[PDB]
Amino acid sequence: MLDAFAKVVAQADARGEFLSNTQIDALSKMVKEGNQRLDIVNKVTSNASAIVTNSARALFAEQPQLIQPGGNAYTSRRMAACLRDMEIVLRYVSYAMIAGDSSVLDDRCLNGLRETYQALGTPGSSVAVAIQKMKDASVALANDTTGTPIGDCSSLVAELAGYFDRAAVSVV
Amino acid sequence: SIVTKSIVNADAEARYLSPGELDRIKSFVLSGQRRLRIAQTLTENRERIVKQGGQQLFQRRPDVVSPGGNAYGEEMTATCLRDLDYYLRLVTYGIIAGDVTPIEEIGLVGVKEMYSALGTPISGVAEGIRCMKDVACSLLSGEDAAEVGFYFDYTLAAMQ
Amino acid sequence: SIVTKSIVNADAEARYLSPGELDRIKSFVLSGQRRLRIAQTLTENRERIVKQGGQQLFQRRPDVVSPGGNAYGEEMTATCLRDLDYYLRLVTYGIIAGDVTPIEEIGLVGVKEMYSALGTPISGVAEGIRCMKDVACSLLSGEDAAEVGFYFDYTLAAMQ
Amino acid sequence: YGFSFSVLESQVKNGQISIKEFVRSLGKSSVYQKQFYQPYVNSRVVELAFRHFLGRNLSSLAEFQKFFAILSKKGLTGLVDSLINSREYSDYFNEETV
Amino acid sequence: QVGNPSTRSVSVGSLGPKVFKSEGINSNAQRTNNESILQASYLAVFGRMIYQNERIGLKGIDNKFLDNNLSVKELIRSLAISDTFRSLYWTPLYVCKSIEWIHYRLLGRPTYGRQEINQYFNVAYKKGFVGVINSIIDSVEYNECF
Amino acid sequence: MPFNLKTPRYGIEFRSKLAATQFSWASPIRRFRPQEQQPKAGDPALFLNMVQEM
Amino acid sequence: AYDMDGTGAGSLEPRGIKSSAVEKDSRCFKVTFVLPSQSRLYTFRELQNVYTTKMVPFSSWYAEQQRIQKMGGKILKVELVAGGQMRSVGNQ
Amino acid sequence: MKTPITEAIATADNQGRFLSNTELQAVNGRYQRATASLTAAKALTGSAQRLITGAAQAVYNKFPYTTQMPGPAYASSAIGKAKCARDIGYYLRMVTYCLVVGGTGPMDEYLVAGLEEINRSFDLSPSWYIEALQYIKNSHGLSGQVANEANAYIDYAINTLS
Amino acid sequence: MQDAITSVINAADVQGKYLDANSVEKLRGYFQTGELRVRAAATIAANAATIIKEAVAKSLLYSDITRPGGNMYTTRRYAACIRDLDYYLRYATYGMLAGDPSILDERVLNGLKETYNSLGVPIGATIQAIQAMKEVTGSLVGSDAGKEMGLYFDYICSGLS
Amino acid sequence: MQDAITSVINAADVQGKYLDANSVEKLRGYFQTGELRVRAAATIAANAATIIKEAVAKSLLYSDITRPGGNMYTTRRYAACIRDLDYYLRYATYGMLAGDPSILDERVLNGLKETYNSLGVPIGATIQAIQAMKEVTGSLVGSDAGKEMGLYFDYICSGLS
Amino acid sequence: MQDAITSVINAADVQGKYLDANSVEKLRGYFQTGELRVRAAATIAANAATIIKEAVAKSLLYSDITRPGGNMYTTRRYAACIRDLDYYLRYATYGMLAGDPSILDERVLNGLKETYNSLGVPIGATIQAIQAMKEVTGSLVGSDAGKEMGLYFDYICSGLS
Ligand SMILES: *CC[C@H]1/C(=C/c2[nH]c(/C=C3N=C(/C=C4\NC(=O)C(CC)=C4C)C(C)=C\3CCC(=O)O)c(CCC(=O)O)c2C)NC(=O)[C@@H]1C
Ligand SMILES: *[C@H](C)[C@H]1/C(=C/c2[nH]c(/C=C3N=C(/C=C4\NC(=O)C(CC)=C4C)C(C)=C\3CCC(=O)O)c(CCC(=O)O)c2C)NC(=O)[C@@H]1C
Ligand SMILES: C=CC1=C(C)[C@@H](Cc2[nH]c(/C=C3N=C(/C=C4\NC(=O)[C@H](C)[C@H]4CC)C(C)=C\3CCC(=O)O)c(CCC(=O)O)c2C)NC1=O
Ligand SMILES: CCC1=C(C)/C(=C/C2=NC(=C/c3[nH]c(/C=C4/NC(=O)[C@H](C)[C@H]4CC)c(C)c3CCC(=O)O)/C(CCC(=O)O)=C2C)NC1=O
Ligand SMILES: CCC1=C(C)/C(=C/C2=NC(=C\c3[nH]c(/C=C4\NC(=O)[C@H](C)[C@H]4CC)c(C)c3CCC(=O)O)/C(CCC(=O)O)=C2C)NC1=O
Ligand SMILES: CCC1=C(C)/C(=C/C2=NC(=C\c3[nH]c(/C=C4\NC(=O)[C@H](C)[C@H]4CC)c(C)c3CCC(=O)O)/C(CCC(=O)O)=C2C)NC1=O
Ligand SMILES: CCC1=C(C)/C(=C/C2=NC(=C\c3[nH]c(/C=C4\NC(=O)[C@H](C)[C@H]4CC)c(C)c3CCC(=O)O)/C(CCC(=O)O)=C2C)NC1=O
Ligand SMILES: CCC1=C(C)/C(=C/C2=NC(=C\c3[nH]c(/C=C4\NC(=O)[C@H](C)[C@H]4CC)c(C)c3CCC(=O)O)/C(CCC(=O)O)=C2C)NC1=O
Ligand SMILES: CCC1=C(C)/C(=C/C2=NC(=C\c3[nH]c(/C=C4\NC(=O)[C@H](C)[C@H]4CC)c(C)c3CCC(=O)O)/C(CCC(=O)O)=C2C)NC1=O
Ligand SMILES: CCC1=C(C)/C(=C/C2=NC(=C\c3[nH]c(/C=C4\NC(=O)[C@H](C)[C@H]4CC)c(C)c3CCC(=O)O)/C(CCC(=O)O)=C2C)NC1=O
Ligand SMILES: CCC1=C(C)/C(=C/C2=NC(=C\c3[nH]c(/C=C4\NC(=O)[C@H](C)[C@H]4CC)c(C)c3CCC(=O)O)/C(CCC(=O)O)=C2C)NC1=O
């Protein structure tokens, strides 16, 4: 597991030189944005169980055959497993937002998630539909200017949007 | 094209085109503005017409996508919708060419031999084109939806 | 192959292949199984050889990726690694053929005219091929990198 | 390719038209001129027509000039009619033999 | 040349092509067109300018001509008997289609008939690609015209 | 790989044999990608994921 | 396109039968005849039926009837089964 | 055309009199400000395609429904994505016209007169253009009075849409 | 054969693309000139005998080819030769309507040079008759349609040399 | 074949007269209802497969004809059955367009009663199958268009009995 | 080859005439515009490597013609294509200087459509590159010389079409 600072340390550890004085200015620009980072995470971790169930409900109206009798997410054993499966993706996306780099997203979550949907028979294209349902709810809640000073945060919600559509192309 | 069939037909007799044959060319080039606009309206609705058309086809024919059907699987259903895109592209060629000869020379000559060899039910490809016709005919006006539907029903008649 | 140049060299003289000329051909086929193993190593490490060769090319020549360089941008940089993928493929051809003719006939004749007409620095493409060589010679044994080193070296000398 | 001349087959299976009349309406058809009339010059069309409606090749130079002039003046149907209406066709093929 | 066999070498004029001559006319007799007669030789043998990668192997030939150490006949010969010429106009061609072409380059005309095309086809069967070139450049019509 | 993502509840050999009674689902439609936008050998769009890891 | 474009004597096209049919005429007769081979005794081809009843287009009846007569055949009956009589326009 | 030059002529011509120093002082203030205005007009022009392609992307990341919904009013096809970037280049071109002329005259006639009849008819939402104009304000990269002259004509456009 | 419309469709279909903006402008270039081509095609069909009759008198009437020893001496060779001029006029008119010289390759020019070499017909005198026939036609149909017809007269001559 | 336009040209030409007032009135009767036939002609061409499938199953599907020994038994018989019904539907559409049933007497009813009697085809059942094909086709084109359409279905059945 | 002056001398010699007013008009027409041609010919020689580099990238650089499998894929085939564009540009300048397209017929267009049909070179894509080369050169040389230069780019594509 790395954070954003660890990928600059461990890169030049393989090159073996000291960290340059123009690279410290890139790390100090990150800690100036370090407190706008912490309320993108606090906005999405607090409405976490309503990002999930409002995105599942939007999925099951577009593709109604996933919940009809003989469908994949039909029973009450498997509706709960489908609802869990978006909670785990939203968990590791917010983990990779607070670290700054995606090295824990594709390690404990995406490392072979595609190959276990071929074994389970789960439609992997429909999990990537319901991740982009959750991307549209989470970047709208990271623009919420209540209890926070007004400023430009467009470069950090575009990084949160990057970890959502990385986990969508890794299941199809 | 309307011009092509008039020139080859008057070559078999070894003569020039008649005023009745030349007026069909004048009457056709006058409608060129309406044909270029109708084809543009369909080309801008590819993902909706193709996606909407294949969505209704799997409710009138649920067996083709179930276990055992021809289009069973994500990659097979992907090539399923690939075929519908071929015939939507051919329909835009016929609307612009002024006749159905592009639809015939590309994808109707030998269509029953192709689909029987691939193991595909030809009756399902004609059901999927009839569903795309309803979607495409709901994006047009009263007169433009009438003629665009005739290009979809022609493809189905030649596909049975 | 040596077979091709041995027949073209003997065809022009209007005679059969010579005794020593045949012994070279026999020695080639006896090492053909080993040539397939060396070329098999580079083929499954192709993306890693291009990545590491791509990174270290941009540290020894940062002018090619800076504002005003030929490979400035992410799309123009993609064309950088595309060209590096070509030459890594052509060296695998030369390994199996036991000769440089597959490299020379595909991407060495007219290479100065081609890059000169694109505005691309021919001096830098040789630097990238030299950076791909050390990674390739890093995944091979002592004498296997001595075999692959011949084909990587011929490509650079012709590119200057 | 799945072509079909359905009205022509039912008329020839029932006996209303002979095989000579079946071959004649297959020559002046649209599938024929689409394949053996359009992609060729008038010189090459006269030679390929002798192979289909007569089963042989042109023999003399005066035989080409006689049928090139008919095709040049009356098109396809003026040529196919002059080959089936000839004495050589009926001599070898009389109304029932392909 | 068939109604006037002695018209060989007599320049036609402005009706024919341009003739390049390694002349060397001056008050000191210095050749000032050594770089133009070399450009004209590549266009006579190959018809075009060869690539910079294949012209590398012929740089030893051009260096000796520009230094005033080769005649045009020994330069035209050393270009035709090269392996880039052989790889272009001899190997990928029918054997009598190469003689008909090679004869048209070194001599400005195609063959007259079968007694001339069969003569070279026998020189190719025995000696090879190089034997055909030397038999056209050492010809009597070559030395009389050029 | 983590072992919960290595060995799931059932494998490919139990799922494929029951496609008549259970596990009959047929798959929904993917997002429609047009065929002429797909990359071919010698396209620089097959290296844009390499360039974003630089 | 039609056989009556003026081609007659002293033209470039050889003298043949000329019909009075319009371009793409659609009149057909119904004929009956017998036509012996009169050449099988030196060619030795197989034997064929010579009693024929068939529909022949208007465009070819002048040439067909003129060919059956030259070759010794005998026409037993002929009727018009398609087309109008003395129609001015509408034969196409 | 609201220019400081033509507002001076129309003030003297309302009462049928010559240009006094009430009017020559008004057009003096155009010329003192024209130095900062004409340097912003070159800077917004030279970085136009960076700003137009950046601000068109700013609407899609803010309103993702405009790339998903079916209809002629949204930018879901390539036709609608081309008519979107045409409009952003219309808003940027009017702003540089106002900095050249000096007043809010070009974008009054060419851009905002009749605009709300268009957005009501063609079902275009004016919040898309406020989001796009607020990208250009934060990313022209200017400073000083060059930035204050540019931000004023950008904020004039935001108040007409709101 | 393929006209200007089908030539645009095949160029797009061979790539798998729909008709984009670059091909739509070529489709508009043909519709704008469609009424001009139908107007010239009707006047050429009515003056065909006088276009051929005046192109022959101007090029090869009292020449050497009409006297004994030359090509086209006898009446069959005079009649067979003006039947060739009636091919080029009629097929140059098809190409002008279709806006594509494709029909001149298949049904006219494909193998026409070898036919004339075996028959012994002079190609230089045939090209001069088509060129004289191009000038007479250009005066009947005007200057705009006249240079369209000359576009397909030169395709026959360059496809014949 | 002669349509409504040609049939009035015929009546005038046999007298040597121009088109008088009574003639121009019949011509307006055709033009005024013309675009209604073109609309009905395309509607039947699109529903041709279903107009025959529902007429056959409703008229002769489980009868004695489809059973062994009966007529229309073998698949060749069945395919010849529904190949005939499409012939009538396709030719009745040609007659409604032209407004004159002359095309039905030349290319459909050309001695069709003798052919059906020789082969042994039940004339009583074919007439009732065409009648069932008239009640489903009338549901599509409406009454105003269904009036002209049914005018020719009865022409085939009347000329067949 | 013959230039504009020679074409006037020969047209008078074929008539047996001294140079009259009509031929003196064509002589001055070349002498007046003669120094405008020597300027365009000097600017094209300097921007030669640029006119080709801009018409290639404008027309055929990122298509499937350069990818594997396309004609002109390898470096030998790439270098051979830009050598063909070098001759077309270089020969259209010879024609503009001489004021007569005779140079193009005898050294460029003779048997050139048979040469490309033998090798498999696409003639359609070759015409596009010359059209792109026509406008890139028309912007450098101006409006007067840019139109006369395009007169000989169209002569090449017409004979190559
Ligand atoms: C709406 C969601 C779609 C769907 C989901 C679905 N998934 C499962 C089962 C599993 N998913 C995983 C993946 C992970 N598990 C993990 O613990 C982690 C982090 C380490 C990942 C990335 C695994 C292992 C399973 C198996 C059991 C589980 O742990 O949850 C199921 C149930 C399968 C069953 O048949 O019981 C469903 C229904 N299916 C759909 O229909 C939707 C498209
Ligand atoms: C892009 C940000 C969003 C978008 C754009 C979109 N706009 C239109 C249509 C029109 N836009 C205008 C605006 C102007 N025209 C002008 O001349 C000027 C001043 C120079 C302005 C500001 C007008 C008049 C139209 C309609 C007429 C036309 O098409 O030209 C469309 C097309 C809508 C339609 O129904 O045709 C689109 C798609 N839409 C989005 O979703 C983007 C977020
Ligand atoms: C552990 C809990 C914890 C938090 C929740 C944050 C909360 C937080 N954010 C900011 C400070 C800030 N917070 C924002 C954030 C936003 N403005 C917006 O318009 C967006 C809606 C939103 C984030 C997406 C900005 C832009 C600033 C800096 C003000 C500025 O520079 O303009 C500050 C003040 C810091 C300072 O004064 O230096 C604090 C305490 N930090 C924490 O330690
Ligand atoms: C021996 C020559 C011969 C054949 C073959 C023949 C076939 C024939 N098959 C029918 C078939 C039919 N065949 C099926 C067969 C089916 N098979 C399956 O595997 C499915 C479960 C089911 C649906 C396809 C059904 C359902 C019908 C009746 C269709 C209907 O009327 O709805 C009918 C319609 C009713 C009738 O029997 O009269 C005929 C005439 N007739 C002949 O003279
Ligand atoms: C332009 C004219 C034209 C057409 C139409 C065409 C069709 C075509 N369809 C194919 C496959 C296919 N076609 C289908 C089609 C279907 N499955 C269903 O359930 C439906 C009933 C049906 C229509 C959507 C399937 C599933 C395959 C893949 C078959 C397989 O992989 O086994 C293939 C083989 C793979 C390929 O090259 O794409 C071709 C060539 N080619 C053409 O040139
Ligand atoms: C490299 C490919 C290649 C071949 C093979 C080739 C053959 C070739 N064979 C020739 C003649 C000949 N070839 C034969 C051959 C035969 N007579 C027989 O009875 C046998 C069946 C047969 C040999 C097995 C004869 C008799 C002649 C002389 C013909 C003559 O003198 O008119 C000639 C004419 C010689 C001349 O006119 O100078 C050539 C060029 N040329 C080529 O480029
Ligand atoms: C050599 C033996 C022989 C003869 C004579 C012959 C005649 C013959 N005359 C015909 C028609 C005709 N014949 C006439 C002739 C006449 N109208 C009048 O008013 C007259 C009194 C008469 C002129 C003397 C007309 C008008 C037709 C066309 C009938 C129609 O089109 O309705 C036709 C129908 C085919 C066609 O017209 O091309 C044949 C076969 N066939 C033969 O094999
Ligand atoms: C051997 C067979 C044969 C014939 C017959 C023949 C005829 C022939 N007649 C010609 C002209 C002509 N022929 C005539 C003839 C006539 N004017 C009258 O009033 C009379 C009715 C009629 C003669 C009795 C005239 C006036 C011309 C010149 C027409 C012109 O220059 O426009 C010409 C064009 C110039 C020339 O003489 O070469 C030819 C080729 N050529 C042949 O090879
Ligand atoms: C559809 C394209 C097409 C064309 C054009 C064509 C021409 C063609 N022209 C022919 C003859 C001929 N063509 C001419 C023509 C001419 N004599 C001259 O002096 C003039 C230069 C020229 C008239 C412009 C002559 C005189 C003959 C007869 C040759 C002979 O009888 O020996 C022949 C031999 C048949 C015959 O002798 O009647 C053919 C097949 N075939 C085709 O398929
Ligand atoms: C274009 C105008 C036209 C018509 C109408 C036409 C009819 C026609 N119907 C036929 C046979 C037939 N027709 C039927 C029809 C039927 N069976 C029934 O039970 C129903 C009553 C009826 C449905 C309409 C059947 C079963 C045969 C086959 C008879 C056999 O093979 O012995 C045949 C014999 C050729 C063949 O076997 O295909 C002809 C020629 N031909 C024509 O050219
Ligand atoms: C198999 C033999 C073979 C080769 C090698 C080949 C190269 C080739 N390289 C190209 C471009 C290119 N190559 C580069 C490369 C570089 N920029 C730099 O600064 C560096 C020095 C260098 C990377 C190491 C760039 C930037 C382009 C695109 C230039 C442009 O689009 O203007 C292009 C044009 C577009 C395309 O890729 O199709 C071709 C055809 N083609 C072939 O058939």
- Of the ligands numbered here, which is closest to the C-alpha atom of A130? 1
Is H98 annotated as a binding-site member? Answer: no
Task: State how far residue E51 is from chain C, nearest Cα, in angstroms.
Answer: 6
* Cα-based distances in Å from J155 to J140, J143, J152: 20, 18, 5
Sheet with G51-54, strands from edge to edge, namely G51-54, G28-34, G74-82
Closest by Cα among C65, B4, A137 to I99: B4
Q: What 3-state DSSP class applies to G80?
A: strand
DSSP annotation of G83 reads: S
C108 CA to middle of ligand 5, Å? Answer: 41
Please report, for chain D, how many H helices and E strands are present, in that order. 6, 0
Q: What share of chain C is helix, strand, coil (3-state, %, to 5)?
A: 75, 0, 25
* Cα-based distances in Å from B47 to H69, K95, K128: 11, 52, 32
Experimental method: cryo-EM
Exposure class string for A12-25: b at 16+ Cβ within 10 A, else e = eeeeeeeeeeeeee
Residues 6+ apart with CB under 8 A from C78: F44, F45, F47, F48, F50, F51
| H71, two tokens | 């209809």
Residue G90: in which H helix or E strand, if any?
A: none
A123 CA to middle of ligand 5, Å? Answer: 22
Q: At what angle do helices C144-158 and C74-97 cross, to 10 degrees?
A: 120
Task: State how far residue H118 is from chain B, nearest Cα, in angstroms.
Answer: 21
- Ligand 6 and E93: CB distance under 6 A: no
Q: Are the beta carbons of C114 and K78 closer than 8 angstroms?
A: yes
**Cβ contact, residue pair K75, C110, below 8 Å:** yes
Q: Are the beta carbons of G16 and G31 closer than 8 angstroms?
A: no
Q: What 3-state DSSP class applies to D60?
A: coil
- Ligand 6 and E121: CB distance under 6 A: yes
Q: Are the beta carbons of J138 and J149 closer than 8 angstroms?
A: yes
Residues of A in contact with B74 (CB under 8 A): 123-125
G86 contacts chain I (CB < 8 A): no
**Cβ contact, residue pair G55, D95, below 8 Å:** no
Q: What's the per-residue H, E or C state across chain A?
A: CCCCCHHHHHHHHHHCCCCCCCCHHHHHHHHHCCCCCHHHHHHHHHCHHHHHHHHHHHHHHHCHHHCCCCCCCCCHHHHHHHHHHHHHHHHHHHHHHHHCCCCCHHHHCCCCCCHHHHHHCCCHHHHHHHHHHHHHHHHHHCCCCCCCCCCCCHHHHHHHHHHHHHHHHCCC
Residues of B in contact with G1 (CB under 8 A): 13-15
- Ligand 1 and A91: CB distance under 6 A: no
Task: Determine the Cα–Cα distance for residues H136 and H157; give it in Å rounded to an integer.
Answer: 12
Residue F6: in which H helix or E strand, if any?
A: none
Closest by Cα among A95, A73, A94, A97 to A84: A73
J79 contacts chain B (CB < 8 A): no
The position carrying tokens 């090679």 is E102
Task: Determine the Cα–Cα distance for residues B11 and I2; give it in Å rounded to an integer.
Answer: 14
- Ligand 1 and F5: CB distance under 6 A: yes
- Ligand 9 and I89: CB distance under 6 A: no
- Do G and J make contact, counting contact as 3+ CB pairs within 8 angstroms? yes
K56 contacts chain C (CB < 8 A): yes
- Of the ligands numbered here, which is closest to the C-alpha atom of B113? 5
From the CA of F44, give the closest atom in ligand 11.
37
| G52 beta partners | G33
State the CB neighbour count (10 A cutoff) for residue E95: 13
Task: Determine the Cα–Cα distance for residues I51 and I43; give it in Å rounded to an integer.
Answer: 11
Task: State how far residue K123 is from chain I, nearest Cα, in angstroms.
Answer: 13
* Cα-based distances in Å from B79 to B82, F26, F35, I22: 5, 14, 10, 29
Task: Determine the Cα–Cα distance for residues C24 and C19; give it in Å rounded to an integer.
Answer: 9
Task: State how far residue B98 is from chain G, nearest Cα, in angstroms.
Answer: 25
* Cα-based distances in Å from B151 to B120, B145, E16, I18, J38: 23, 10, 64, 17, 15
- Do H and G make contact, counting contact as 3+ CB pairs within 8 angstroms? no
Q: At what angle do helices I21-31 and I4-13 cross, to 10 degrees?
A: 170
Q: Are the beta carbons of E10 and E4 closer than 8 angstroms?
A: no
Look up residue H119 and give its amino acid.
Answer: N
State the CB neighbour count (10 A cutoff) for residue K33: 14
Exposure class string for C78-112: b at 16+ Cβ within 10 A, else e = bbbbbbbbbbbbbbbbbbebbbbbbbbebbbbbbb
Q: Are the beta carbons of H91 and H111 closer than 8 angstroms?
A: yes
Closest by Cα among G9, G64, G72 to G31: G64
H84 CA to middle of ligand 2, Å? Answer: 6
**Cβ contact, residue pair C110, K53, below 8 Å:** no
Task: State how far residue K41 is from chain C, nearest Cα, in angstroms.
Answer: 21
Task: Determine the Cα–Cα distance for residues C69 and C62; give it in Å rounded to an integer.
Answer: 9
Task: Determine the Cα–Cα distance for residues D51 and D64; give it in Å rounded to an integer.
Answer: 13
| G78 beta partners | G31
B74 contacts chain A (CB < 8 A): yes
Residue A136 sits at φ, ψ, to 5 deg, of -70, -25
Look up residue A71 and give its amino acid.
Answer: G
Please report, for chain F, how many H helices and E strands are present, in that order. 2, 0
Exposure class string for J11-31: b at 16+ Cβ within 10 A, else e = eeeeeeeeeeeeeeeeeeebe
In total, chain C counts a number of residues equal to 160
G50 contacts chain D (CB < 8 A): yes
Q: Which residue's alpha carbon is nearest to atom 36 within ligand 1? A: A78
Residues of B in contact with H67 (CB under 8 A): none
User: Is residue B77 classed exposed, middle or buried when 0-12, 13-18 and 19+ CB atoms within 10 A define those classes?
Assistant: buried
Exposure class string for A38-71: b at 16+ Cβ within 10 A, else e = eebeebbeeeeeebbeebbeebbeebebbbeeeb
Residues 6+ apart with CB under 8 A from J68: none
Task: Determine the Cα–Cα distance for residues K90 and K104; give it in Å rounded to an integer.
Answer: 11
Q: Which residue's alpha carbon is nearest to atom 27 within ligand 11? A: C79
Q: DSSP states of chain I as a string?
A: ---HHHHHHHHHHTTT----HHHHHHHHHHHTTHHHHHHHHHHHHHSHHHHHHHHHHHHSSSSGGGSTTSTT-SHHHHHHHHHHHHHHHHHHHHHHHHTSTHHHIIIIITTHHHHHHHHT--HHHHHHHHHHHHHHHHHHS-STTHHHHHHHHHHHHHTT-
The position carrying tokens 């090619």 is C64
- Of the ligands numbered here, which is closest to the C-alpha atom of H120? 2
Look up residue K95 and give its amino acid.
Answer: G
Q: At what angle do helices J34-46 and J75-98 cross, to 10 degrees?
A: 170
J115 contacts chain D (CB < 8 A): yes
- Ligand 2 and H74: CB distance under 6 A: yes
Task: Determine the Cα–Cα distance for residues C73 and C59; give it in Å rounded to an integer.
Answer: 16
- Ligand 9 and I129: CB distance under 6 A: yes
Q: Are the beta carbons of K18 and K6 closer than 8 angstroms?
A: no
D40 contacts chain G (CB < 8 A): no
Q: DSSP states of C90-134 as a string?
A: HHHHHHHHTSSHHHHHTTTTTHHHHHHHHT--HHHHHHHHHHHHH
I83 CA to middle of ligand 9, Å? Answer: 8
Closest by Cα among G60, J74, F12, I125 to A117: F12
Q: What 3-state DSSP class applies to B146?
A: helix
What number of C-beta contacts closer than 8 Å exist between F and I?
A: 4
Residue G76: in which H helix or E strand, if any?
A: strand G74-82
B13 CA to middle of ligand 11, Å? Answer: 55
Please report, for chain H, how many H helices and E strands are present, in that order. 9, 0
Task: Determine the Cα–Cα distance for residues K96 and K118; give it in Å rounded to an integer.
Answer: 30
Q: What's the per-residue H, E or C state across G6-72?
A: CCCCCCCCCCCCCCCCCCCCCCEEEEEEECCCCCHHHHCCCCCCCEEEECCEHHHHHHHHHHHHHCC
Task: Determine the Cα–Cα distance for residues J146 and J36; give it in Å rounded to an integer.
Answer: 11
C9 CA to middle of ligand 6, Å? Answer: 25
How many angstroms separate the most distant Cα atoms in chain F?
50
- Do F and K make contact, counting contact as 3+ CB pairs within 8 angstroms? yes
Torsion of CA H135, H140, H141, H142, to 10 degrees: -130
